[PDB]
Amino acid sequence: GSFVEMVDNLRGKSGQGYYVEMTVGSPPQTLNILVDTGSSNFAVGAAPHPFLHRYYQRQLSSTYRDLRKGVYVPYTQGKWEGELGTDLVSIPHGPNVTVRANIAAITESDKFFINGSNWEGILGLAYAEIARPDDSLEPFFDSLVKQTHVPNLFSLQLCGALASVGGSMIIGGIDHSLYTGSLWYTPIRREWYYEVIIVRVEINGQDLKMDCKEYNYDKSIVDSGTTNLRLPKKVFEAAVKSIKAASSTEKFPDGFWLGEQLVCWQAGTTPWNIFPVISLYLMGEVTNQSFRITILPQQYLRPVEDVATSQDDCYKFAISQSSTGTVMGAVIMEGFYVVFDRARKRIGFAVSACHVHDEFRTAAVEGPFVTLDMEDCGYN
Numbered sequence: 001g002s003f004v005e006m007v008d009n010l011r012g013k014s015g016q017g018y019y020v021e022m023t024v025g026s027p028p029q030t031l032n033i034l035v036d037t038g039s040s041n042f043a044v045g046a047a048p049h050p051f052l053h054r055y056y057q058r059q060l061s062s063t064y065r066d067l068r069k070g071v072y073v074p075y076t077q078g079k080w081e082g083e084l085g086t087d088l089v090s091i092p093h094g095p096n097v098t099v100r101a102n103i104a105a106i107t108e109s110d111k112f113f114i115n116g117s118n119w120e121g122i123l124g125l126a127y128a129e130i131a132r133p134d135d136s137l138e139p140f141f142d143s144l145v146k147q148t149h150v151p152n153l154f155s156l157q158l159c160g161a162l163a164s165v166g167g168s169m170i171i172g173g174i175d176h177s178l179y180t181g182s183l184w185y186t187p188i189r190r191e192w193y194y195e196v197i198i199v200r201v202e203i204n205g206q207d208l209k210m211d212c213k214e215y216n217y218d219k220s221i222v223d224s225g226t227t228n229l230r231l232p233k234k235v236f237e238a239a240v241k242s243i244k245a246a247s248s249t250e251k252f253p254d255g256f257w258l259g260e261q262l263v264c265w266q267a268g269t270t271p272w273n274i275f276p277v278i279s280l281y282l283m284g285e286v287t288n289q290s291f292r293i294t295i296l297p298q299q300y301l302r303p304v305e306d307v308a309t310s311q312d313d314c315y316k317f318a319i320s321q322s323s324t325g326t327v328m329g330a331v332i333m334e335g336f337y338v339v340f341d342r343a344r345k346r347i348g349f350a351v352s353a354c355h356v357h358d359e360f361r362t363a364a365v366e367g368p369f370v371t372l373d374m375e376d377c378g379y380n
């Protein structure tokens with residue numbers, strides 16, 4: 001209901017992610033840690049990489065235990081390698097508890113840390129099934145719940161605005177001051193990523209009319225560690241086609257839609273109203289029942305601040321194609337208060353009390369709707 005100590009416990013800079021302060025070891029070493037619902041390892045810089053403000057110094061911790069096992073973790077765009085151990089962990093602006101958790105001490109990386117960012121590790125909040133090297137490495141939140149009385153759920157309010165960003169991570173509950181209206185829940189299809197099922201997509205109220213299975217090819221997930229709304233290729237093609245149409249009073253280079261060039265307007269003259277809203281219908285809690293979440297151009301047209309060769313307002317098209325399914329990143333989550341109700345295997349959405357909107361349109365969460373054959377939307 002109300003967890004005042006945890007409100008506003010997230011920080012970041014635009015495009016560089018949201019982080020929470022944590023301590024690791026005895027005595028406690030403070031580190032800023034990126035909050036990532038799209039992975040399941042707790043991995044921290046443990047060596048003086050030049051990009052890092054600080055790093056985990058295992059030699060200073062009396063409660064450090066070595067698992068004597070390494071882990072090599074490649075991504076599409078980078079990689080880290082580290083040494084597994086366990087140690088005492090806490091969240092200063094979180095529950096008043098200390099737990100023994102797995103920690104991967106990162107000892108080598110490439111294109112992982114960000115030059116100029118203020119975080120030096122990652123907190124993977126997803127499930128053991130996708131932990132590296134395998135699912136016997138218990139994720140942080142699983143340890144937290146097993147070792148304490150913290151309820152098995154957490155919620156994220158990501159507020160957006162290099163400008164500073166902020167938000168809240170409520171550990172073990174929900175703060176009803178962070179949202180308006182009602183929460184609506186969609187089932188977690190499988191506990192690996194936070195996988196959900198999209199059953200309908202509308203641009204400005206007009207249905208895309210695809211076989212809904214396409215929306216979830218090969219999965220759809222909710223991911224605080226991804227900035228864009230990523231869409232499967234076939235779906236991205238139809239969504240762009242329809243967004244181009246709704247916004248055809250102005251024209252834009254093909255490269256802009258492909259995220260290959262920015263687009264700029266005179267400071268203060270961005271044509272929000274020429275861009276359509278985007279609605280995702282999600283599978284609901286009941287047979288044949290769905291609800292819809294709606295986002296604005298304010299969410300999927302993102303300011304790019306660090307353009308030294310321009311003085312105008314420049315923006316990046318932040319919807320993009322994927323070959324790993326739909327990814328509801330920050331473009332989606334910044335419109336909503338999102339509740340990761342692990343105990344009940346469901347994800348709640350409500351309109352965020354802090355989301356960015358204008359005088360004509362606001363983000364919305366609405367239901368119930370009648371949607372048939374929603375089980376056919378899932379990819380097997």
Ligand SMILES: C[C@@]1(c2cc(CNC3(C(F)(F)F)CC3)c(F)cc2F)CCSC(N)=N1
Binds near residue numbers: 016018122224225
């Ligand atoms: C672990 C990973 C990851 C995320 C970020 C966070 N990416 C950001 C974001 F959080 F803002 F999205 C900084 C740009 C990294 F920095 C490094 C990673 F390996 C892999 C890529 S997608 C994901 N959910 N998690």
